[PDB]
């Protein structure tokens, strides 16, 4: 797949003025734009291949972000009232929306989710024509809006505008965005006690972010109990990850790490060598 | 942005005739379309609200339609009356869905049918002082246009219709005057 996603965060700060508001845009696993109402309170480029867009684009995106911030300010007041919370506490409204392309480059699917204070609130259905309450009483405002109308405007965005511009972005940044960088792999050995050592399987400088690291033992079909770290950014646009297995000291060469990544023509197998 | 156009800017129909007021908008992503009436020197008053999922709304001789995909609304005024004479404004929700954007409006004039016209010109004297007078062209057809003076020392008003409801009687009139005494009310109008 390819995806165009935005991540919106609004945080109320009662007494200290209007809520903090941040939007970030991603094409696949590459951030390309950001808005911050505390920062130049505008949408700004965050990938090199975005820097030569006209003021028309930046003015439009700035106002869309601004308008979202203002509506999220209204939503935070509504949600405070809904959960019967104090006007003194800080609360968080999060909004995620994205469209994806299939192999053919046509619309595959869209999605939108809201969260209040880190909990699922409201989800756009897979048909994109109605909203599902995840929390009880969660809705599009019956009184001041329309479930069907809201879904329709988001559906048009996801099926049309989101797909159209995902293509424009993939073209503008194709040298980086469409390049598969396979993981550089190795295994390190770390004695932790007299009787046990940690085998750590490394994947470095890979793109995109999706990757599978599994440990197997020779003579055992099942995969072993594995410590996985969160996939982390290198800061250069590539990612890092490792999987660790605790094994008996002296028995390290009986274990294999198996690495699966889009940029690898077939799965890679590594074995620690002393 | 959302852009709203109303065609035409000015419309003049004889009373009893059906007429359409047109509204087109560039962005089909709207929640509501609203039609308003505005009388001279007054504010707007809402006639019809059509929701994005609705196709038509009716109010007596008013029937508005909505086609989102085409980006059109038509206000149909059946068997038009003189009292329908007003400015009709069309509004849709802006792109943010936070305020209403208005078209420039259509000024509608439903001309009163003068059944037995009797065009005449008269001279009226000031109630306070003599040798101070105005000319009155009255009882003419509603289809007869009042000509501009083309003198610059002679002023001529546009026509208006008044309704003597007590005698179920309507009459058009226009006024003319000057500060020169080399001016008679005869052929003051052309």
């Amino acid at each position: 797949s390819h995806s165009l996603k935005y991540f919106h965060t609004s945080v109320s700060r009662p007494g200290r003025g209007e809520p903090r508001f941040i939007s970030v845009g991603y094409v696949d696993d590459t951030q390309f734009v950001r808005f911050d109402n505390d920062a130049s309170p505008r949408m700004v480029p965050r990938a090199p291949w975005m820097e030569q867009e006209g003021s028309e684009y930046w003015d439009r995106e700035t106002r869309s972000a601004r308008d979202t911030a203002q509506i999220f300010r209204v939503n935070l007041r509504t949600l405070r009232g809904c959960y019967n919370q104090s006007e003194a506490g800080s609360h968080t409204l999060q909004w995620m929306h994205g469209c994806e392309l299939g192999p053919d480059g046509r619309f595959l699917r869209g999605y939108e989710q809201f969260a209040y204070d880190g909990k699922d609130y409201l989800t756009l259905n897979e048909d994109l024509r109605s909203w599902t309450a995840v929390d009880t009483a969660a809705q599009i405002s019956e009184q001041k809006s329309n479930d069907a109308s809201e879904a329709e405007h988001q559906r048009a965005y996801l099926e049309d505008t989101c797909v159209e511009w995902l293509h424009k972005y993939l073209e503008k940044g194709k040298e980086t965005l469409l390049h598969l960088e396979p993981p550089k792999t190795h295994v390190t050995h770390h004695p932790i006690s007299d009787h046990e050592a940690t085998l750590r399987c490394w994947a470095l400088g890979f793109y995109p972010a999706e990757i599978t690291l599994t440990w197997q033992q020779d003579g055992e079909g099942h995969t072993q109990d594995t410590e996985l770290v969160e996939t982390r950014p290198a800061g250069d646009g590539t990612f890092q990850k490792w999987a660790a297995v605790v094994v008996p000291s002296g028995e390290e060469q009986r274990y294999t790490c198996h690495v699966q990544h889009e940029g690898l023509p077939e799965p890679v197998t590594l074995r620690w060598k002393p | 942005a959302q852009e709203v156009t109303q065609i035409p800017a000015a419309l003049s129909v004889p009373e009893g005739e059906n007429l359409v007021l047109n509204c087109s908008f560039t962005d089909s992503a709207i929640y509501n379309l609203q039609w308003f009436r505005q009388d001279p020197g007054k504010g707007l008053t809402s006639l019809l609200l059509i929701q994005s999922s609705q196709r038509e709304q009716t109010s007596g001789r008013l029937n508005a339609s909505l086609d989102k995909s085409s980006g059109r609304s038509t206000l149909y005024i059946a068997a038009s009356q003189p009292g329908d004479s007003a400015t009709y404004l069309c509004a849709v929700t802006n792109q943010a869905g936070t305020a209403l954007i208005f078209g420039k409006g259509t000024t509608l004039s439903v001309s009163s049918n003068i059944q037995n016209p009797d065009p005449a010109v008269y001279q009226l004297r000031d109630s306070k002082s003599s040798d101070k007078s105005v000319c009155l062209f009255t009882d003419f057809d509603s289809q007869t246009n009042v000509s501009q003076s083309k003198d610059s020392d002679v002023y001529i008003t546009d026509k208006c219709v008044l309704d003597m409801r007590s005698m179920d009687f309507k009459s058009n009139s226009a006024v003319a005057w000057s500060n020169k005494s080399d001016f008679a009310c005869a052929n003051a109008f052309n």
């Binding site: 935005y6 919106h8 939007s23 845009g25 949408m43 439009r60 995106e61 869309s64 972000a65 308008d67 979202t68 509506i71 999220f72 209204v74 939503n75 509504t78 949600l79 009232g81 809904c82 409204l93 909004w95 929306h97 939108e112 809201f114 609130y121 409201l122 909203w131 009483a137 969660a138 809705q139 599009i140 405002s141 019956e142 009184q143 001041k144 809006s145 809201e150 405007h153 988001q154 965005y157 505008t161 989101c162 159209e164 511009w165 | 992503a29 792109q95 943010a96 869905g97």
Partner: peptide, 12 residues
């Protein structure tokens, strides 16, 4: 590109 519209959330 961002959507022009943010959904209005409610209660009940």
């Amino acid at each position: 590109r961002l959507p022009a519209k943010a959904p209005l959330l409610g209660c009940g």
